[PDB]
Ligand binder design. Structure first.
Ligand SMILES: O=C(Cc1cccnc1)N(Cc1cccc(Cl)c1)c1ccc(-c2cn[nH]c2)cc1
Ligand SMILES: O=C(Cc1cccnc1)N(Cc1cccc(Cl)c1)c1ccc(-c2cn[nH]c2)cc1
Lengths: 302, 302
């Protein structure tokens, strides 16, 4: 037993991290087969970043301006294109360590592992969630751009995130691996607004189930509630409205613990209205919404 | 910016995880050069675990009883010995992916990455700390035994932990890679007592420095205190007494932030005596002691 914010094992992704240099600027890139993916603002100079015309900037560029280094093996660039906010650098050698992979655009609320990188070398690994407002709360210093997020299913890496920018608010924003930003963000150094970030209600319920499984039962109570009335409380407290789909997904947790979803909802209501009065749940003095039902199932059965 | 519980990248260690089977029992093992390290209670049957005579049990055993599988490559066992609470299985083939490694016995308070494994396959990765009482708070299900903890310096994996057991209290205990338990624990299924677990004071101070670096300054106050009087407060609250060595180690953090260590100590005193009154520090409603000064330096400079 025990419960931890657990990342996926990062080796399959380690073998794909490269360094990409365009003039003075250096960031990370993702080498899969014979294509290297990286943020297009690699082609900007520091002043270019306030109002960059990416097409015009890319036009001044030719294949040989893009220095791509994998460890120390230098890669020869044979083609270059711009897809949305990513650069696709066609190179001459397929990555021999390309794992089986897919590009997926994840849904707000889902989670993924991030492998923070600098200069094409991996720094560290941590789990995080696409927030309802399409930001993420991570750990990214200058040069970490192009670090990727991913899930691992079976034998297959599903890349879902590439990091592009730190907002003035200190949270982080980026794209899918087709270069479409998550959220309303654009890759210009202008001040930009992340909306209201609500709490992922279904995730908090899955976390309470994990807590029950692991001995923490003090929040279990003699009440229940209803989807509609619970949701009234959820709206008071900037929680995501709960739906029948969310209830179904909590099915297996309900069944293994023998606690109806709506009863757990009443417990959560009580916590929302009366706080935690100084106790803890699975080691935290706050309600945790960055575990999905699937995360709990995965960790509680190996 | 941003601050996260970050694990080391796990690939170098992924390439060393094997599966070890002795009769009915299966757990994980660590293949470095031509030696496989695993917990000796692999040689026990479920009933054997209450009062096992490990020497006698090992004597009934020969090289060919030990089924060692790396992925699907089966390893031939050519020698076997017991070192403290680990089995050293000499095999015929050196691990081609052996990284540069060392065995180190870490000190309470230091941290490391854990790669949780089942059936010799890696499940996930997370950071954790050797608590002052030599337990760890992790995520370990049956079959996770032999999962290892490690740090990565430069180009070199320093293995410090192998997981052996879950205490009835739900925390976790294990050995160094020479098979010496951390703490007073023995590998018998008897009830065993982890002592009082105090809080790692120097780690909490490093965390407050990280918080300051990242915008959270609300706990900074107009006081200071003294090593002795601070330590009186620390003792009231089951914190580790702070020493001049701890102060020196916080040197670089002090210098980069321009905050004297004793001033940060006065802030921490105030937090200990008056709580947090419902606010948060780097996203947590509790004082965090599982970052070392070195962890903060590492994450805040890349
Ligand atoms: O945030 C970042 C990157 C970052 C920093 C720290 C942590 N994470 C990400 N910016 C600001 C920013 C603002 C608005 C939109 C975006 Cl896309 C980026 C950034 C990006 C590129 C350059 C640059 C230098 N030479 N050429 C281009 C300079 C600043
Ligand atoms: O805790 C664990 C392992 C564990 C479980 C879950 C998470 N982590 C670790 N035990 C109990 C225990 C008690 C006291 C001392 C120790 Cl060393 C182990 C355990 C170990 C081996 C066997 C066994 C089965 N067949 N042969 C041997 C059975 C139980």
């Amino acid at each position: 037993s025990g419960f931890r914010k657990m990342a996926f094992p990062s080796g399959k992704v380690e073998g794909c991290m490269v360094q990409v240099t365009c003039g003075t600027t250096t960031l990370n890139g993702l080498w899969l087969d014979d294509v290297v993916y990286c943020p297009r603002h690699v082609i900007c100079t520091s002043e270019d970043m306030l109002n960059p015309n990416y097409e015009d900037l890319l036009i001044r560029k030719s294949n040989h301006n893009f220095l791509v280094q994998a460890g120390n093996v230098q890669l020869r660039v044979i083609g270059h294109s711009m897809q949305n906010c990513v650069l696709k650098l066609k190179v001459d050698t397929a990555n021999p360590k390309t794992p089986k992979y897919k590009f997926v655009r994840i849904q707000p609320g889902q989670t993924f592992s991030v492998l923070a990188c600098y200069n094409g070398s991996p720094s560290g690994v941590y789990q995080c969630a696409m927030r309802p407002n399409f930001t993420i709360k991570g750990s990214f210093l200058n040069g970490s751009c192009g670090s990727v997020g991913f899930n691992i299913d079976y034998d297959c890496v599903s890349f879902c995130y590439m990091h592009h920018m730190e907002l003035p608010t200190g949270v982080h924003a980026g794209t899918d691996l087709e270069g479409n930003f998550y959220g309303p963000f654009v890759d210009r150094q202008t001040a930009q607004a992340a909306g209201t970030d609500t709490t992922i209600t279904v995730n908090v319920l899955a976390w309470l189930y994990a807590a029950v499984i692991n001995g923490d039962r003090w929040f279990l109570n003699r009440f229940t509630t209803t989807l509609n009335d619970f949701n009234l409380v959820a709206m008071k407290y900037n929680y995501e409205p709960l739906t029948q789909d969310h209830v179904d997904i909590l099915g297996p947790l309900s069944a293994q613990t023998g606690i109806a979803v709506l009863d757990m909802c009443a417990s959560l209501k009580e916590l929302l209205q009366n706080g935690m009065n100084g106790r803890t749940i699975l080691g935290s003095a706050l309600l945790e919404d960055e575990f999905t039902p699937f995360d709990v199932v995965r960790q509680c059965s190996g």
